[PDB]
Design an enzyme around this catalytic site. Sequence first.
Site, PDB file in Angstrom:
ATOM      1  CD  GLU B  13      -2.963  -1.361   2.125  1.00 52.09           C
ATOM      2  OE1 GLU B  13      -2.401  -1.372   3.238  1.00 52.09           O
ATOM      3  OE2 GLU B  13      -4.190  -1.634   1.974  1.00 52.09           O
ATOM      4  CG  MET B 174      -8.513  -6.335   8.410  1.00 53.03           C
ATOM      5  SD  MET B 174      -7.574  -7.842   8.062  1.00 53.03           S
ATOM      6  CE  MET B 174      -7.219  -8.416   9.713  1.00 53.03           C
ATOM      7  CG  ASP B 198     -11.705  -8.080  -1.034  1.00 55.05           C
ATOM      8  OD1 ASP B 198     -12.631  -8.306  -0.207  1.00 55.05           O
ATOM      9  OD2 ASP B 198     -10.616  -7.508  -0.742  1.00 55.05           O
TER      10      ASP B 198
END
Lengths: 230, 230
Positions: B13, B174, B198
Amino acid sequence: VQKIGILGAMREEITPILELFGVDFEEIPLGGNVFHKGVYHNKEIIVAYSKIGKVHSTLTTTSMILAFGVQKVLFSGVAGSLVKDLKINDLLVATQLVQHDVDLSAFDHPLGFIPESAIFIETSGSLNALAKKIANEQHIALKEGVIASGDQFVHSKERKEFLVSEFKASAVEMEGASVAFVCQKFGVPCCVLRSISDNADEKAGMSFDEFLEKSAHTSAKFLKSMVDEL
Amino acid sequence: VQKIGILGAMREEITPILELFGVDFEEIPLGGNVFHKGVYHNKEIIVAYSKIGKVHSTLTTTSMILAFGVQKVLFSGVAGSLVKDLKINDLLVATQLVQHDVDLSAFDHPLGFIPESAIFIETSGSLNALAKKIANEQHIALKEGVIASGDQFVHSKERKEFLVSEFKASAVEMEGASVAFVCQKFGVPCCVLRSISDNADEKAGMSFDEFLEKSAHTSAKFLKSMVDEL
Ligand SMILES: Nc1ncnc2c(CN3C[C@H](CSCCCCO)[C@@H](O)C3)c[nH]c12
Ligand SMILES: Nc1ncnc2c(CN3C[C@H](CSCCCCO)[C@@H](O)C3)c[nH]c12
């Protein structure tokens, strides 16, 4: 002087700590926590409750280390028992901790595991050995074992069985693993001490309400006896 | 100068973030994280990946604020979509975040709630409005909504349905809630930006593996466009 951080999760876990040390404290607010700073037996003690759970306890521990420069962290509080030999009021120290609610099994990682970390987090062998020495000299039972930490209050037979089978945990709580994790990242000795408040089963809420005060006091008293030898 | 913290969870990321800014960085290790410190358009930018999950992200955010003194935190990464209108690669900013795995319902607390806290954590309205302005000027779709954060990779229809019904979440990840929580405790403006990787269903592991790189790049590019206007 030596600087010692002392943590509980709830206010009820630190109330007896503040009373038992019996010194004056200066209150210092930081990051939504109140840090009670005092001097006791030629040591600087910094006492705080984190508030419940992993995020709260991670933040407070990080603050203690980075902002107050503590050299050891001792955690004192209550826990749910996962084993027959740990009864209400009994003490244990965590030899290792796990985050029991971590689940990256979709990528075939073992439960509790995160890439670039480990399932089990270790605590200070030296502090655990001190605790054991003191317990023996006071004729107090003290167990050593794995403590499982997560962001749920556990009150079911099914979840207990999972914690025992997956991690061989002896007790469950919501903060220890995060406190130990942070300490390990910064090279700071950590001891996680808990007194049993409930059996983490369908009756746990009841038992917790009944025994929080007494079990917190038991843990606090033992933590003080440790600080007396540091 | 202005100091801006920039966070991802995984190395993937932040790789595009470091490349897109295209300046030199000094690497500074602290608390098991590596902070990349650079100067870009007369601002000090501090870039790091936290590692996955709530404890990691809480620690890294706290470090950014306390040790590096950042004045804003921008989070960029990927997320699972919970709504039909958020498709692979689409961007959203979190208006509020929740810790979806917090469960103190044994004491009749609502799910997501912890005493002395709140279910929903707010982000910077000003940064979210900047994001919206930029998105409109670039002719890019940008959704605003609730993001749910927890310590499980979500890959089931049953868990998606829970997140939608309980919290009205639009996406799941998360780390966002922990980053926003810490920022709010220290009065630091926070923006959580995610690009869909996703659909958080039985196929999510597959989709994530396929789209992590591209979706991370999409988020990173947008984050840079925000920094260009700060
Ligand atoms: N059965 C149990 N499951 C998880 N944690 C615990 C604990 C330890 N702490 C006690 C406390 C439980 S949540 C209390 C909520 C009180 C009503 O607002 C958390 O700080 C964790 C004792 N028994 C437990
Ligand atoms: N379906 C999903 N559930 C939870 N989080 C996410 C995310 C966001 N992040 C992506 C990453 C998922 S865990 C990746 C593990 C890779 C194999 O080691 C975490 O940092 C959270 C995308 N899709 C998700």
